[PDB]
Design a binder for this molecule. Structure first.
Ligand SMILES: Nc1ncnc2c1ncn2[C@@H]1O[C@H](COP(=O)(O)OC2CC2)[C@@H](O)[C@H]1O
Ligand SMILES: Nc1ncnc2c1ncn2[C@@H]1O[C@H](COP(=O)(O)OC2CC2)[C@@H](O)[C@H]1O
Ligand SMILES: Nc1ncnc2c1ncn2[C@@H]1O[C@H](COP(=O)(O)OC2CC2)[C@@H](O)[C@H]1O
Ligand code: NA
Ligand code: NA
Lengths: 529, 632, 667
């Protein structure tokens, strides 16, 4: 009953999902109980072919069928999924839903100031993505190119990512807060042929110099032929360099509201996302197309319990993986609306998140514990002003969630009527690795619980390098086989990838984190090592 | 029986298809009668998916299947057909027929002088297209490029077009009678990477300077990297620029007679065709939808069977040659007669001599040529055996009842069906036409709208559809159709403003028409160019006249431009006098007819409102003034 | 009849049935039941190519897109095409599919010049290395429609380079590692290659060969080559790499992952260029398509050699030549079996090396040229008894005639009279076997290639009348009456040369350049080239190219090169040279050596003349053109038979020619 190693697990009562979760659920859940989850999970570990093939055919639309579900090993860094298949990410995120229901909302955009907020339908999104992709195509962007994005969290960032993917090019999103030198490093490592940005940004009421930093960086980025500049503030004193910089509205007005998507192979790169590592300069994590999209759709459907009637609010930023997988690809693949918030949880007041959740009857909310701490400190009383009865799944990501913060989140935001998903994962995993499925897995505050489909998690003794048998254990967290959404390389530097992830413990994927596993199989993340 | 509006139709007896038509028809007709036509037409309007899906699979060969038959709306300018599909135009016009019957004639080429005439089979055409496509491929031409063609109406023009389409590039054919400036404008707007032309041309016995005008134009066309030059006259004095120009024969001899075609998407551009009042605009046509329209209209309106032979006396420099000298007939796998010369050379019987020589079953020509031959060569017609013909088409302009009767009697001997085909460059293929052997004729009427064409008459003042027959108004189309043009090259806003925004929810043909008690349409010609300001349609000419009535005004020019709020805005070029002129227009025309702004200028273009249009959107010397005052 | 009045080779020749031990060692039921089934299937392959080759193409190749038409075009119009509309990838069919099925199965059994450096790559290993090299090439801009040169010895890196280039839809052009810098230059420039794959140095017979050095020398004049990939075969640090152009195989492949998607190409997109010598002077890049070439390779390897999944093939060839292309690489790898890639010579460390390798790996199939058989019979017979060769059942011979005596020697000393011998007739332009005895099916006549293969409708044409010869006991020009899947499709950027060489000499036919005879049983007997092409030790040479090389020496005024029989190399090249101002018989030996070295450095060591004859002038017609017929007749000791020479402008010269050949051919 007691734990000698996993001290966090002693005297922790399981927390079943509240009845109101199932009352607010629009349809029968996707999994009935934990026993069915464990059957499906064991099948996903022992027979990835027969588990993931059918799901890949169910959740994604293919332009060419695949012939092999899974190939490669971790030790050889040659992982591949759905080999021979062809598809397009923008077709799966936009076109098919637009044909099905063009007036269904897609991007619920909340601007830094609410007066500028708007809503794009899937039909709208198809037209705007097509026009921007037509601009990029006229400029010579084609499959195999990279295109940089330097935009805030708003419709233009989503449209730019989808338009780049529509051509089979790989987008490289650069968080709008980066310095000119960070922009330069990333652009040059990726050899981007084009950049998409805006003139200025609005954050918490303040105006941010965006094009200015781009211009500073581009003096050292010779590969950038053309820049597309959105008029976010329309400030006339913002310089565009003749022959390089063009306005978003002016160029998109020249092209039609439909452009054919370009088919890419399952293993063609979908994007580069640059991350800081423990050794040296930024490294470009490369994600494939089919595997990443399947992981995004699968984790969004099963871990958050997303249905067609639902509305996801991922309070993240597309500059990071969270916005990639769960503000954009995850929800759009499933054809539900997603809320794109440009501002901050404090402007105009600390009720912004909640005013938004009420306004759009959001059903899912996904945020990092940092924001939870900020709102507990400075804006608790605001929560009661707004109706949050539409929610049933509350997500937490990025860092450990202390039991204190977990209980506060559960009571004040969830009104003790929602399910909480502590999702553990990382930029290189593509999608959730360990997380409690909504309406299925009972919670232990501070614990991410069970590994997800295709994630064969294990603990390794660092001193010896040997895998640790049995529960009530602690050690380095690692995965014993690759999974569909695993990152495939570091751009033009596969040796760094091998040394970072595959070579510390040959045969395993090294997460860089230490964790504990208790007598129930629940995992407790203990941070970086 | 009487018409109070459609005066053309009063006292007009229907003209049934003559029995000789069905005697000469090689097989059972494709449609039995008008009732079957109407059932099929109603399905093509109410259920485009169930009507055009099966036809697209029947008439075209696909590399990848389509998942959606029809997408988009006119209002949003995002029409698309057969989404997800892949195909190749040259495979559908050449390869499949060559594999089925390589010795069947494809291009029956009649040169300016008959001594130079020849016939290419489908196998011959496959080899020549493959070799030219190999030359272009070795030069770097690929999907997404544009390639200019400046060639007379002969085998090399057809081969060039098909070879460019074989690589998935888009051809832009430039009528060989165009000047150097016209070549330059079109090549630069399209940013063509290569050009295919010839040294000189032969027309009416005269030698025309083709390569010379090309050089003149190319001095200012930096995107053209290479030129392929056919030796039409083999004149040794014709200079080739080293490193840029290469000979057709020399380069094609280096490559094999088969080259794989490149699959393109249904909505990838097949061609740009530049149109000749203001600035030339590149009408862009898709691949799958355009080809389907070409095949469908050629088959059903002309009644084309595998045994038939089509003579379209047009020029690939224009949409008629594109669609009914090349794509339509070759798609159906029949021979097409490509005539390089004039109706008068060596004499005024040449058209009829060609029909007799090749036993053509179908003849398609513009009323302009019919009038010329009636005036100068009538007696020549009877000198030739024209009994192989059963379908006589007319295109491009109204055919008066009198010219229709002359055509019917002197060419058709009262034994052929006449198809007065109404359509335009932007429609891709026939919009309103009497189906051969099916629809009875009223001379001068185009008769019924074609498959997928939901035609209507619109009140020009209110934009509201006119219900019932015995009516007149603006001819408009209520939904897009497979072969509708998709954009204006790199200028989609001009496309929207020209076709979709004047009457939102409709396609604007620019023509007026009348509809009689039988549902037959009578084309009435161009309308008067209204500008749409927040739903009020204004006449630039009326505003100019009203401004001119003011005796202190010397000259007035009124133009329209795009406006994100009011759709269009009106700018007049001519502090207190400006207000006086605006009030003058308000009290002469109406309160809402006032220009958005009156700009007092001392100069205006003529040497031409086009300059004013471009100026308002941010004697050559005069130009400066226009700009200066607009800066005011 | 039983007697032959024309095909003398066939008189008194007893058929040689397949020995029973062949069937004892055969691992499964044969692919063909007996010779009658072979004849039924062959007739279908001629009368109904669509119904015969469609199903086989669907069985043996994996398609990304199905084909809609099996066969198109005619020889006369030079527009042959097969499996139109199809899409596939050669590296997927040679690697990926087998790696997915059995990643640990051996693929490349690599025997290095020194056995200590030997190793084995599995299909999984091969997939990873091919993917990495393809990743390097892709990052350099190589894409479908480009050509990439390979200048590598016969080892794993050559195979990997070829497959990596094909993985991107680019066409490889392999340049035999015995070529000089000028030959590399000619081929690289005619193809406009964007990149080159080579190595620092080579190992042959224990000697170190200069590979990268010759590449640098040639590349000074190859402006289209943007980047070079260099494998460290010896890792000699003194080997210079040019900054900005040359990069190391290991360094660059370490940057990319072990899987890269293959690029789908059309059946008729070019798979490779192989530069071949003819009666011209300039090498011609023979172009092979993808689907048809691969189908021919798989089909001939499977049916003529009787290859099964359990078998192991040792083709003692070099990828620098078509034999290595088709039967060391594409054929076996398509069929998913291991192939032995031998970097060395038959003589090093001793003359048992071939048999040591066969025994080491229990090879079931061995494929070699008669030149090597003659060498081993002369110098290494005593080695054979040291080795267990009982794993073998199919012994192939390629590239040149196999005399009845050599056939018997091969049959007895290597096969122990228990193996089937496959004398395979074919050529670079045919892609795969044209006439050959199917192992276990066709009985042999020693010296005869036997029956034409599937899709090969062979004929004999009267050299006087140009008319096809009906009936048997006949002789004439060997021609083929319709194209076949693996037929070469063009000469790179010179289709007119292709037409003039192969399709126009005998309209409606393919001209092989060979003469042949057909006996009363329908067996074909190859009689050798009719077009004066010379084959020295399996290498096709251009007498005109050798003449040009000799003339480059400014001491030479005129040069005429001819071919003759040679007991060692099959044919030998004899060069006749007239000098400007020479004389002095003491300088003769030295100047002859100088000219031989000139040829060695212009073309390559293997193109050196057997002998250089210094004469005072060459025989010429009234029009001033050299009459090589006289030099041929003299060089074969047939001075009698020269006949009336009063038609020459300089009949007096003939005497000298004869005397000179008598004095100098020996010494
Ligand atoms: N639920 C969690 N509980 C405890 N720790 C967590 C949790 N989620 C993330 N982490 C830490 O963040 C890194 C990933 O950061 P990254 O920005 O790459 O991806 C971010 C996640 C989008 C992990 O390696 C780990 O140390
Ligand atoms: N049967 C017809 N009866 C009366 N008028 C006609 C008819 N066909 C065309 N037109 C006029 O020509 C324009 C199109 O010209 P375009 O050169 O683009 O297309 C050329 C015709 C292929 C129409 O809008 C219209 O005004
Ligand atoms: N079994 C054989 N019996 C007699 N002669 C043969 C045989 N195989 C080839 N040849 C001669 O080689 C030329 C082609 O040589 P190539 O190097 O192109 O291809 C060689 C095959 C690799 C043939 O035209 C012919 O003259
Ligand atoms: Na494809
Ligand atoms: Na496909």
């Amino acid at each position: 009953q007691t734990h000698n190693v996993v001290h966090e697990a002693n005297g922790v009562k399981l927390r079943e999902t509240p009845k109101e979760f199932f009352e607010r659920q629009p349809n029968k859940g996707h999994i009935h109980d934990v026993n069915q989850y464990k059957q499906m999970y064991e099948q996903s570990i022992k027979d990835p072919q027969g588990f993931f093939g059918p799901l890949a055919k169910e959740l994604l639309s293919w332009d060419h069928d695949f012939h092999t579900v899974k190939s490669g090993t971790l030790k050889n860094g040659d992982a591949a999924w759905f080999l021979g298949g062809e598809l397009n990410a923008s077709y799966n995120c936009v076109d098919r839903h637009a044909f099905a229901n063009p007036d269904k909302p897609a991007l619920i955009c909340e601007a830094d100031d609410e007066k500028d907020s708007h809503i794009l339908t899937y039909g709208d999104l198809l037209r705007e993505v097509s026009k921007v992709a037509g601009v990029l195509q006229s400029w010579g962007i084609k499959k195999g190119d990279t295109v940089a994005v330097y935009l805030p969290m708003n419709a233009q960032a989503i449209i730019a990512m989808l338009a780049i993917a529509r051509l089979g090019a790989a987008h490289s999103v650069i968080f709008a807060g980066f310095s000119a030198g960070s922009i330069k490093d990333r652009v040059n490592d990726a050899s981007c042929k084009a950049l998409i940005t805006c003139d200025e940004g609005k954050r918490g009421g303040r105006t941010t110099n965006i094009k200015k930093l781009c211009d500073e960086a581009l003096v050292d980025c010779p590969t950038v032929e053309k820049v597309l500049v959105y008029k976010r503030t329309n400030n006339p004193e913002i310089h565009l360099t003749e022959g390089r910089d063009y306005y978003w509205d002016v160029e998109t007005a020249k092209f039609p509201g439909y452009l054919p998507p370009v088919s890419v192979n399952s293993e063609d790169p979908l994007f580069l996302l640059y991350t800081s590592g423990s050794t040296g300069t930024p490294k470009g994590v490369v994600h494939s197309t089919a595997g990443y999209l399947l992981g995004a759709a699968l984790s969004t459907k099963y871990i958050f319990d997303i249905h067609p009637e639902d509305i996801l609010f991922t309070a993240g930023d597309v500059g990071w993986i969270t916005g990639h997988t769960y503000a954009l690809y995850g929800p759009l693949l499933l054809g539900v609306p997603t809320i794109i918030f440009e501002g901050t949880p404090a402007y105009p007041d600390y009720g912004r998140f909640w005013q938004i959740v009420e306004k759009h009857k959001a059903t899912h909310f996904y945020v990092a514990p940092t924001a939870l701490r900020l709102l507990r400190k400075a804006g608790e009383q605001e929560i009661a002003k707004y109706d949050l009865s539409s929610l049933r799944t509350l997500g937490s990501v990025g860092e450990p969630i202390s039991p204190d913060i977990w209980e506060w989140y559960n009571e004040f935001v969830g009104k003790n009527q929602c399910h909480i998903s502590d999702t553990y994962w990382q930029t290189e995993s593509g999608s959730h690795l360990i997380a409690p499925l909504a309406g299925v897995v009972p919670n232990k505050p501070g614990s991410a619980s069970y590994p997800f489909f295709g994630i064969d998690a294990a603990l390794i003794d660092p001193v010896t390098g040997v895998e640790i048998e049995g529960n009530d254990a602690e050690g380095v967290l690692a995965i014993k086989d690759h999974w569909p959404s695993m990152a495939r390389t570091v751009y033009k530097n596969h040796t760094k990838y091998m040394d970072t992830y595959m070579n510390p413990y040959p045969g395993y994927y090294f997460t860089g984190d230490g964790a504990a596993r208790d007598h129930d199989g629940y995992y407790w993340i203990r941070g970086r090592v």
